Amino acid sequence: LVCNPWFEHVSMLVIMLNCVTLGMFRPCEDVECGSERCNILEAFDAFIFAFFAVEMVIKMVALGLDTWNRLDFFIVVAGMMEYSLDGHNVSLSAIRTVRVLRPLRAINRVPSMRILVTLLLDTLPMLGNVLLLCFFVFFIFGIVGVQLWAGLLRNRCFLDSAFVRNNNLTFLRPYYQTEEGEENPFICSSRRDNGMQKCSHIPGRRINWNQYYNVCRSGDSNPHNGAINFDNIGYAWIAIFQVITLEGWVDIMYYVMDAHSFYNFIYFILLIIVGSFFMINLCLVVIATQFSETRIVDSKYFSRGIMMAILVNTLSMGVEYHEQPEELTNALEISNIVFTSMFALEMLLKLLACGPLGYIRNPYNIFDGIIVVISVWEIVGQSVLRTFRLLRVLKLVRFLPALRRQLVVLVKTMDNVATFCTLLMLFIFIFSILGMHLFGCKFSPDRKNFDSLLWAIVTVFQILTQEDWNVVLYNGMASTSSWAALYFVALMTFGNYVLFNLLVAILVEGFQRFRVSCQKVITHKMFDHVVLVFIFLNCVTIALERPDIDPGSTERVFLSVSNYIFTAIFVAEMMVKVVALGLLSGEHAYLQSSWNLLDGLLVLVSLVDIVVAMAGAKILGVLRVLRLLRTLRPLRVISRAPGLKLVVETLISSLRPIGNIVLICCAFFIIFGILGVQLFKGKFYYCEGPDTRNISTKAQCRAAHYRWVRRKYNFDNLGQALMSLFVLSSKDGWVNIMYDGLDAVGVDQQPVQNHNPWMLLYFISFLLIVSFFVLNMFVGVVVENFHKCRQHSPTRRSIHSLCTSHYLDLFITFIICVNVITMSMEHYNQPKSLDEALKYCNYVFTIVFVFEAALKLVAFGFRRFFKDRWNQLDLAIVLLSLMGITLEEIEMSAALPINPTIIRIMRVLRIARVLKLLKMATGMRALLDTVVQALPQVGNLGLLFMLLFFIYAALGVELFGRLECSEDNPCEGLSRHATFSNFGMAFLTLFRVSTGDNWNGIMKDTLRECSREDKHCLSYLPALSPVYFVTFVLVAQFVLVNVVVAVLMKHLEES
């Protein structure tokens, strides 16, 4: 019965059987219960539920009245309620949802998966301090957002009520709305605010009605069908949660810039730095620590010959492109015969040298054998076997022992990855079925839907990658209820929590006479500081450069003259230093260090700039190239600052241990790049027009007077293919590229939605394998840092007792906790009765703090009281509260000498009372301290991060400073808020790129061609653009990775 294993096997078979019937659910067809197919599935489910009742009875009879035994009881109890309730028509379909819990029974039946889930549950309790820090972020930023932006995103530009009445015409739509509709709302700034968008910015007609929408006031709805707004604490948290995931966080920022003020970017930069970066990556650090506490053939020349032969063949497959000349097609097949024959000869010699059994004694010889016969099989049989010619690159692991030793190490990582993958697949399956029950057949259809198991799993998988997950959220909220956000919050939270534990699991198994004067000047203590000032001033000159400076303006004269002065100063600095040390004859000479070589090259480039500028000659092309190099002069700051020099050299040394993983990742990119060209070259064209459903070929597109155009990210050649793979790896806009590959039909054929669903294997396989390499690169850097780190008064006394006793602290805690509750009750258009109730509460809390300060004064004495910082903090809030109450009362009276701005700020500043809880949070203070001790390392990396932005911010203005956007030449990523028109706007844009929010959209806008009519084009910008974004993304991520490692190491040694 119970003391034998086969009874558990039978239980596992029935549990697996339920997984099949749950996946067979059809949300559109089964909910009506009409089909015979349905009738037998409910019959199967009743059969399965009957067994589960029998199992529970037997195990009950055997044992008498363990989390996992409770769990089976909960599932049986809930199932019986649903099973027996059949008969009452009220909410029966909603109660059917409890069935999605049943696959959880597999956890306890599978031993290895049972142990893993035990470790997760034992590690969760300790995350209380991280959770406490999370509440502080959501409450502080939640209340601040509501008091600032409540009801503003309902603003629209309306017609004047007097205008519509006196003119006796009502055919006009009441408020301005774009031709697209309410999905693109024109949010306007009210007269009592200073937002970026006014009703005077409405375009004219394209018979002048648009100019009569001249009053800005509240409408009925907020953006995205009411999903995005700050009308209450509830909607504020949904907006904050989306920002913390760094998905569509700029669209939220643009709304409040249009409606309220430009300087709202401060709110989102602080929320992203504190909330997204530190508060999420402290979750990893905490788990990381806790989980740790818990005669011719054998010749060298012959081997080298075959080595280069394989390499040349592998690379020749990369010269394919869309419109090949047929003589190039024939050349590649001639080249195939030569190399195929060469490997065939190689096998023949080795078979004669060792005999067949001797040849089979080596596995790599067996592998090479299978490829040769498959290659010969293709030639004799003259598109299937062509793809398998990519396997020839695998022969190089024989001749690369260094890479061979890395591959086996990665393989040894995958024996524990398997355990986590099983738990994730069960995790994804449960949410995939849940989504079908909640949202099935209700997103009427969108590609991102839960109408079937295949696209339910893909949608759930997509949400975990956090790509357009906000688009699915708005569908869920609008279709069912605003409380549908908890589905996505739980999915992302638990999904990422489980993924951190995989990263930690790998880490822990990883740990297991004039010359005399010059020499004196160069050795002066103040030489570096004196030169650092000129470098700083030169940076200011670069920041002021922008395209809109008129050539004849005084600013141009100031900037041009400054260039000559700085050029002379740094020529003199170099000269004096070269005289002191010598150029390259001495051992201390100038060019004996790379930091001196860099300065030399910059000075040379500067001199060439003077020479070219002196030319009245056909040197326009060369001039623009030198302008780009002038943006690299700020790099001289690194060598003058010892702090930056150490960090910069540290990052370079950190690439050594992960050198082989990068090479394997690069080889993977090319193998998939070549494969993508073979699959999709020439098929990413499409017809662009208003009525296109009737078009099916290029010829019909031409006939319809439309235009035949190509996607920006495509696979027409290996150069285009690599750019597409990078966008997939970064997982920004990767879903759109996947649709193009799923809809590909052929050359000169219109793509058809979901034409080839089997192409999901190509795109999903690349994301998974690439993520596995990037996961092992982060581990490699951590393991290296760890290995190197470990190698390196009768009436007064009674009051004093009360103040000394803990009773006062608990009373203080209760009052502020109640205050936080009253601060969350504010909301747009709240009733006047609530206004009176809240202001009365403010009276009570202020009096309590005033007494709290008095008693503390009486107990401890003035100066001894004031010594403690916490006591100083109390006095500030008490003082802060008094001025806020005073301003409020006087303004509410008849006199009005105060600005409504000062009242707003004082009202917002009362959120500072939350800091009085921080004293009780001893655990959280220790966690925050862990970051405070890591500033000397994290601080220097921050300087490098800002220096990275400065060079690319200045470079961006030079490259993309003149790119326009218009209805004639539309742009997908750039807008009125994201531009490189000046250094200030370029800095803000790079922060968006750094977070990765739709950075791929900005690159598109630079890949699109120049107009035939317009001037100032750079015909080779589409070639420079990928290099700019690719290098920035990699360097930016690498720098931020080391910041996490710096904090991670300190916590381990500190603990």
Ligand SMILES: CCCCCCCCCCCCCCC(=O)OC[C@H](COP(=O)(O)OCCN)OC(=O)CCCCCCCCCCCCCC
């Ligand atoms: C740290 C705190 C938790 C952080 C978690 C972040 C994610 C929060 C998402 C959950 C909030 C979802 C509710 C949003 C909300 O209140 O607005 C929707 C709802 C209106 O729904 P209708 O579709 O019926 O609208 C039509 C109106 N006729 O608004 C309300 O009805 C207000 C009631 C709730 C007040 C706000 C407090 C909600 C409590 C949230 C707690 C979530 C905790 C999750 C850990």
Ligand SMILES: CC(C)CCC[C@@H](C)[C@H]1CC[C@H]2[C@@H]3CC=C4C[C@@H](OC(=O)CCC(=O)O)CC[C@]4(C)[C@H]3CC[C@]12C
């Ligand atoms: C060492 C560095 C970091 C010093 C600080 C950087 C500044 C030099 C940056 C930051 C703010 C920038 C300014 C932000 C806004 C403007 C207004 C704008 O001026 C105009 O000509 C108005 C635009 C229009 O005509 O519509 C563009 C240049 C300027 C002065 C920017 C020039 C570059 C500035 C001064």
Ligand SMILES: CC(C)CCC[C@@H](C)[C@H]1CC[C@H]2[C@@H]3CC=C4C[C@@H](OC(=O)CCC(=O)O)CC[C@]4(C)[C@H]3CC[C@]12C
């Ligand atoms: C070789 C590997 C190890 C490194 C990666 C370098 C790539 C960026 C190189 C390798 C082969 C190159 C390609 C070889 C041949 C062509 C065809 C050539 O075709 C055309 O002139 C287009 C004509 C048309 O189709 O209208 C355009 C450049 C391109 C794609 C090259 C772009 C740059 C590529 C992809």
Ligand SMILES: CC(C)CCC[C@@H](C)[C@H]1CC[C@H]2[C@@H]3CC=C4C[C@@H](OC(=O)CCC(=O)O)CC[C@]4(C)[C@H]3CC[C@]12C
């Ligand atoms: C290995 C990973 C990290 C990505 C590598 C970076 C790529 C995004 C870059 C490297 C070189 C770039 C290429 C350099 C030169 C060109 C010019 C131009 O190439 C062509 O001649 C093809 C255009 C055509 O079809 O005619 C268009 C883009 C392309 C291939 C670039 C596409 C983007 C590439 C492949």
Ligand SMILES: CC(C)CCC[C@@H](C)[C@H]1CC[C@H]2[C@@H]3CC=C4C[C@@H](OC(=O)CCC(=O)O)CC[C@]4(C)[C@H]3CC[C@]12C
């Ligand atoms: C302190 C944290 C844990 C939240 C729990 C405290 C509650 C007592 C507060 C939090 C936010 C408050 C809500 C904020 C705003 C609103 C919306 C208001 O009007 C609506 O229902 C809006 C309709 C819409 O959804 O558009 C009714 C009061 C209510 C629910 C408030 C009632 C009291 C709530 C639920």
Ligand SMILES: *[C@@H]1O[C@H](CO)[C@@H](O)[C@H](O)[C@H]1NC(C)=O
């Ligand atoms: C323009 O707007 C103002 C303010 O709402 C209004 O008084 C005026 O009548 C409007 N003018 C026209 C021509 O609609």
Ligand SMILES: *[C@@H]1O[C@H](CO)[C@@H](O)[C@H](O)[C@H]1NC(C)=O
């Ligand atoms: C599509 O085009 C065909 C001719 O090619 C025409 O007969 C048909 O009416 C069109 N269908 C629609 C509705 O556009």
Ligand SMILES: [Ca+2]
């Ligand atoms: Ca994105």
